[PDB]
Design a protein around this ligand. Structure first.
Ligand SMILES: *[C@@H]1O[C@H](CO[C@H]2O[C@@H](C)[C@@H](O)[C@@H](O)[C@@H]2O)[C@@H](O[C@@H]2O[C@H](CO)[C@@H](O[C@@H]3O[C@H](CO[C@H]4O[C@H](CO)[C@@H](O)[C@H](O)[C@@H]4O[C@@H]4O[C@H](CO)[C@@H](O[C@H]5O[C@H](CO)[C@H](O)[C@H](O)[C@H]5O)[C@H](O)[C@H]4NC(C)=O)[C@@H](O)[C@H](O[C@H]4O[C@H](CO)[C@@H](O)[C@H](O)[C@@H]4O[C@@H]4O[C@H](CO)[C@@H](O)[C@H](O)[C@H]4NC(C)=O)[C@@H]3O)[C@H](O)[C@H]2NC(C)=O)[C@H](O)[C@H]1NC(C)=O
Ligand SMILES: *[C@@H]1O[C@H](CO[C@H]2O[C@@H](C)[C@@H](O)[C@@H](O)[C@@H]2O)[C@@H](O[C@@H]2O[C@H](CO)[C@@H](O[C@@H]3O[C@H](CO[C@H]4O[C@H](CO)[C@@H](O)[C@H](O)[C@@H]4O[C@@H]4O[C@H](CO)[C@@H](O[C@H]5O[C@H](CO)[C@H](O)[C@H](O)[C@H]5O)[C@H](O)[C@H]4NC(C)=O)[C@@H](O)[C@H](O[C@H]4O[C@H](CO)[C@@H](O)[C@H](O)[C@@H]4O[C@@H]4O[C@H](CO)[C@@H](O)[C@H](O)[C@H]4NC(C)=O)[C@@H]3O)[C@H](O)[C@H]2NC(C)=O)[C@H](O)[C@H]1NC(C)=O
Ligand SMILES: *[C@@H]1O[C@H](CO[C@H]2O[C@@H](C)[C@@H](O)[C@@H](O)[C@@H]2O)[C@@H](O[C@@H]2O[C@H](CO)[C@@H](O[C@H]3O[C@H](CO[C@H]4O[C@H](CO)[C@@H](O)[C@H](O)[C@@H]4O[C@H]4O[C@H](CO)[C@@H](O[C@H]5O[C@H](CO)[C@H](O)[C@H](O)[C@H]5O)[C@H](O)[C@H]4NC(C)=O)[C@@H](O)[C@H](O[C@H]4O[C@H](CO)[C@@H](O)[C@H](O)[C@@H]4O[C@@H]4O[C@H](CO)[C@@H](O)[C@H](O)[C@H]4NC(C)=O)[C@@H]3O)[C@H](O)[C@H]2NC(C)=O)[C@H](O)[C@H]1NC(C)=O
Ligand SMILES: *[C@@H]1O[C@H](CO[C@H]2O[C@@H](C)[C@@H](O)[C@@H](O)[C@@H]2O)[C@@H](O[C@@H]2O[C@H](CO)[C@@H](O[C@H]3O[C@H](CO[C@H]4O[C@H](CO)[C@@H](O)[C@H](O)[C@@H]4O[C@H]4O[C@H](CO)[C@@H](O[C@H]5O[C@H](CO)[C@H](O)[C@H](O)[C@H]5O)[C@H](O)[C@H]4NC(C)=O)[C@@H](O)[C@H](O[C@H]4O[C@H](CO)[C@@H](O)[C@H](O)[C@@H]4O[C@@H]4O[C@H](CO)[C@@H](O)[C@H](O)[C@H]4NC(C)=O)[C@@H]3O)[C@H](O)[C@H]2NC(C)=O)[C@H](O)[C@H]1NC(C)=O
Lengths: 206, 206, 206, 206
């Protein structure tokens, strides 16, 4: 019987709108010793009931019981260590897996905007590109805006480790040629931990 | 013995960095019946221990006991009704004061930037002005940036009710003439509930 | 039982036609000790009967007795300290609340009128704005005139302290686009203590 | 006991000099039932001995037995389905995991090379970028050359699915400013299934 802690999705931490949650999961819960008793400790103080809220589930030939605890942004972004202390009878001595954003003197993500190669103009749909480099840690979200209104045709590579011990990632927003020539202004937003107001925006036009 | 609920400061709600808190206070707590027992209910479910955390305090010729409960942005911005149910013996039937951001189909704050009257150029320190109008509700924060770096010399009128049932407010950033002539770019940021990404920025230059 | 002194409205002080009055008010006057005896002292000499003139009034579960004393412009603008010395039997030692408007070197507000950001022109109703800065003390009132006739659509932020130890405040007069383009002449009037003839007017047009 | 099939590395498939191999691996092989009997079938006909060649290995508290089969370029690029049929006594009915790379009409990536945003020039190290889009299937590898000699400072995002059902990926080669200004010629090489000679190269310079 082994435990697994799950950090929250980025998007949900960086925004005041969402509810980011830390997830703890237990798999391989023997039919004979089905009792699992979760114990959550926030940094140090037990958050007891806090928000923990499981359910049981039959699976493989075993069980999978998942218990969830809500997290306060503030605390997370500030590194409060979150701890899961799960207990069973089959198990010998309760397992205690832990999890916190990975400490690490943050690096202010650099963000540039790059236009389509003359070459691409040859086709009926050009492609704009905004590289987001040298930031830390991975957590970060990118979104595109052509005005106040944000666009649809766009994807975002996940991050890769650079040599700096830094991070970088790209994002494409394919756009119908006309648009681009008709010199419209586009902007890719980058929300992250170190951006002064957890945000910065750049723009591409003609 | 009467109770008073206190909504959180704007700044602390709109940002993922801060810890916005709802404050409940009891004044006029008779020397003979000093026992006050707080009961907090979130929307409906009692948050029992949640985060409540008071202390007693001798004052006037009476007592003032303040108990505080932490609030999750999400929930607040979404209107969860927060309720304080205070009880004493002197008091007849516990008092139950409540409090939630004031419902009200929000209005996307319009934000413009205005330069100094030719007339002001006459002095050794000009003044830039960004009006923030027609938004709702009052909650909103304004900050100034000349580059990535944010400035110091600046104040922000509180809001006033307009005819629209809307709100508006101004903000000055006095700046040394040279600066202004040396065509530097300035920007006043407006963080609010309805701004797509809870933010928008405008700029003033030459 | 607690007393509250009320300085006169600005308009009423700065003009020779109005009668500006200082108001003293008593709240929570216990049904058993309803006797309240007003004692007015101007600067030093008791103004005894002067113009004091109350009446009694039953309220929530208490009484609220208001007594008023007329003030001479001259004396006020010159700083004569006005004092209210209220006495009751319930109360221990009569309360003596005082009131004079600000101490110090009044300063001449300098006023500028500013037009609507081109951007605002995009809408069906532009907005004119006249900042009134660097004045002392807060006392001051603003009024709008598009001709000899003054307008209606307009509000006035209260003052905020600046760094000069000075004061400033703004005022909006939203106006329907056409009229503004139709190059009409508008003026925001500023009545204050240090304006030569306790007034000054500026205008905005095309 | 569970089996895992491993497709060959791209470079090894697209080139006539390398030997690309499909790998089959068995984990959690119980100390009591350590007998694992590998059965390889190419597309349909069992390749019996073919080239299969394992060995046993003790691990955590279990065994991990890896057996490898060499693959003919031709057959692979043509889609021959490769199958691993592993059997043990502990296990109930042998596991048969399969593996062939993608089905469908491969598509010819179109490649563009893009320069660093003027803005980047502000720093001590610019960054070159060549987007590789609209290709199928994911299989593909990129390499950088500044001459005949290929560089080191560079990473390569994995692919992401686009809307065409196509694929695209980027690759950064940070380079010290001077060199870029010193107008040196750089080229990013793209080896893939549909590139005429399973290759194509583009260059960036001044
Ligand atoms: C009997 O059956 C059970 C389930 O049955 C499955 O069977 C298979 C065949 C399948 O086809 C289905 O039929 C069915 O799912 C078995 O349970 C499994 O038990 C495994 C252990 O034996 C366990 O392995 C771990 O898996 C980890 C990740 O697995 C992902 O993939 C699953 C399927 O795609 C998915 O369901 C999982 O949830 C998980 O994906 C991510 O899960 C998050 C939880 O919800 C989720 O988070 C969300 O959270 C917020 C909250 O609202 C919000 O929802 C967000 O959207 C979201 O972020 C993620 O989104 C979600 N992703 C997706 C795409 O949904 C894997 O990481 C583990 O790796 C570790 O184990 C190695 C092996 O021992 C170690 O060597 C490694 O070190 C590693 O752990 C390291 O930990 C270190 C510190 O913690 C790190 O430094 C290091 O980086 C880690 N290493 C790595 C490389 O990760 C591990 O393999 C399975 O997850 C579990 N399945 C499920 C679903 O529970 C059961 O075991 C069976 N019995 C047996 C024993 O055979
Ligand atoms: C014995 O002494 C006690 C204290 O002693 C005081 O004595 C005086 C003379 C003083 O000089 C000192 O010696 C000492 O302070 C007495 O206690 C007082 O009891 C009063 C009742 O008798 C009570 O009146 C209410 O006051 C409300 C606001 O008062 C502010 O001002 C205080 C002093 O400046 C300040 O300390 C208060 O805290 C409060 O200011 C704001 O307080 C928030 C609480 O901390 C604070 O919030 C923060 O929260 C976050 C959390 O971290 C973060 O900290 C943020 O930074 C921050 O936002 C605010 O910042 C803080 N502001 C500042 C500048 O710090 C007043 O609003 C009440 O008005 C209501 O009452 C009227 C009369 O009955 C009603 O008619 C009105 O309707 C009104 O209630 C309405 O409610 C509706 C719905 O709720 C609304 O629709 C409507 O808008 C409301 N109306 C209005 C106009 O408000 C009320 O007057 C005093 O506050 C209390 N003082 C203290 C400090 O507790 C005790 O009473 C004495 N015995 C007696 C009976 O004589
Ligand atoms: C009962 O009840 C009540 C409640 O109320 C309610 O009720 C109901 C039933 C009815 O009946 C009524 O009453 C109401 O509705 C009570 O009483 C109340 O309350 C209180 C007491 O407690 C008071 O006081 C408070 O508040 C205030 C405000 O007020 C104001 O406003 C209002 C509104 O509107 C009004 O009404 C009033 O009056 C005021 O004002 C006004 O008045 C004046 C005079 O008359 C005016 O003027 C006039 O005159 C002139 C001459 O020339 C001219 O003519 C003009 O035109 C006119 O008009 C003005 O203008 C007006 N305005 C308006 C608004 O309208 C406040 O202020 C206060 O406050 C205080 O406290 C706080 C806290 O503590 C603070 O903050 C502040 O500040 C103060 O104190 C102090 O002060 C100082 C100065 O600045 C400072 O510095 C310091 O610091 C402070 N301290 C502290 C602590 O802080 C208060 O609070 C009220 O008012 C009342 N109401 C009425 C009616 O009035 C009672 O009590 C009960 N009973 C029992 C329970 O006991
Ligand atoms: C014991 O323990 C262990 C743990 O671990 C650890 O430990 C230690 C002690 C040591 O010893 C070791 O082991 C380590 O460290 C265990 O085992 C383990 O774990 C597991 C089992 O459980 C496994 O598996 C998992 O993971 C995976 C990953 O893997 C990968 O990676 C890694 C890292 O590195 C490696 O190692 C491996 O191998 C892999 O890969 C690799 O390999 C291959 C082959 O060899 C390669 O290739 C090669 O070959 C070629 C030919 O030509 C060439 O030569 C090249 O060059 C070479 O290299 C490759 O490349 C490599 N790579 C790397 C990375 O390196 C994963 O994958 C898996 O996953 C799964 O599951 C999940 C969940 O479930 C999912 O998601 C996925 O997906 C999968 O499944 C499935 O799949 C499919 C496909 O896609 C899908 O669709 C589906 O959906 C799915 N399902 C689901 C549910 O979802 C897994 O998880 C591992 O691996 C191991 N490790 C090792 C060593 O390996 C055991 O178990 C224990 N015991 C007991 C307790 O029992």
């Amino acid at each position: 019987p082994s435990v697994f802690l799950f950090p929250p999705k980025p998007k949900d931490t960086l925004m005041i709108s969402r509810t980011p949650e830390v997830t703890c999961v237990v798999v391989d819960v023997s039919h004979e010793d089905p009792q699992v008793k979760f114990n959550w400790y926030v940094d140090g103080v037990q958050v007891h009931n806090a928000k923990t809220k499981p359910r049981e589930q039959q699976y493989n030939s075993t069980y999978r019981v998942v218990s969830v605890l809500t997290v306060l942004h503030q605390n997370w972004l500030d590194g409060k260590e979150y701890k899961c202390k799960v207990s069973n009878k089959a198990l010998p001595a309760p397992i205690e897996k832990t999890i916190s954003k990975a400490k690490g003197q943050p690096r202010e993500p650099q963000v540039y905007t790059l236009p389509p190669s003359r070459e691409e103009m040859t086709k009926n749909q050009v492609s704009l590109t905004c590289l987001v480099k040298g930031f830390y840690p991975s957590d970060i979200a990118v979104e595109w805006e052509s005005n106040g209104q944000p666009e649809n045709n766009y994807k975002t590579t996940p991050p890769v480790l650079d040599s700096d011990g830094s991070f970088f990632l790209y994002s494409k927003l394919t756009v119908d040629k006309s648009r681009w020539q008709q010199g419209n202004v586009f902007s890719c937003s980058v929300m992250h931990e170190a951006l002064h107001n957890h945000y910065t925006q750049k723009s591409l036009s003609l």
